[PDB]
Design a protein around this ligand. Structure first.
Ligand SMILES: CN(C(=O)[C@@]12CCC[C@@H]1C2)c1cn[nH]c1
Length: 167
């Protein structure tokens, strides 16, 4: 049993809810919240900007030190950093950004990072300002992630379309 409430069950391991991931993280304090990161961990907008704002910029400060030591992530890659006030840990995952011309086949590689964690609160990778089709992102998620994933979808309209169209 876990703390996650109000989710629709899509599969054995994937759950979905219309929710603000920031507000969901603040309520649940999950072991892992996933960030929709870029390779530079520059948390300007989208999910990343919202998560970072909720940490009062402490996520960005920590991320800048990580990049100064390690250099950029790979598209499809990830790193584990603090969850600050939102979670124990934040798994920063880089999905391909279609608005930069990145290979959508890298979306599967991005979701494979989730398999290193038993339970996660996450957004749909490469959705929103990353430009991918969220229906596609949900299909890749279901077909790739084997651990237990609780997806937060900010937009109610999109949530209802993801559920209604789910095979
Ligand atoms: C990425 N990077 C580094 O690899 C070095 C460069 C000289 C100082 C340390 C480790 C860096 C970025 N900003 N500041 C440093």
């Amino acid at each position: 049993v876990n703390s996650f409430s109000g989710y629709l069950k899509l599969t054995d391991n994937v759950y979905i809810k219309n929710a603000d991931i920031v507000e969901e993280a603040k309520k649940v304090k999950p072991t892992v919240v996933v960030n929709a990161a870029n390779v530079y961990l520059k948390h300007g907008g989208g999910v990343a900007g919202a998560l970072n704002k909720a940490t009062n910029n402490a996520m960005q400060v920590e991320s800048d030190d990580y990049i100064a030591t390690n250099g950029p992530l790979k598209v499809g890659g990830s790193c584990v950093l603090s969850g600050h006030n939102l979670a124990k840990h934040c798994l920063h995952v880089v999905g391909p950004n279609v608005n930069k011309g990145e290979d959508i086949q890298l979306l599967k590689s991005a979701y494979e990072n989730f398999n290193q964690h038993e339970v996660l609160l996450a957004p749909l990778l490469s959705a929103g300002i990353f430009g991918a089709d969220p229906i596609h992102s949900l299909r890749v998620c279901v077909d790739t992630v084997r651990t237990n994933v609780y997806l937060a979808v900010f937009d109610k309209n999109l949530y209802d379309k993801l559920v209604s169209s789910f095979l």
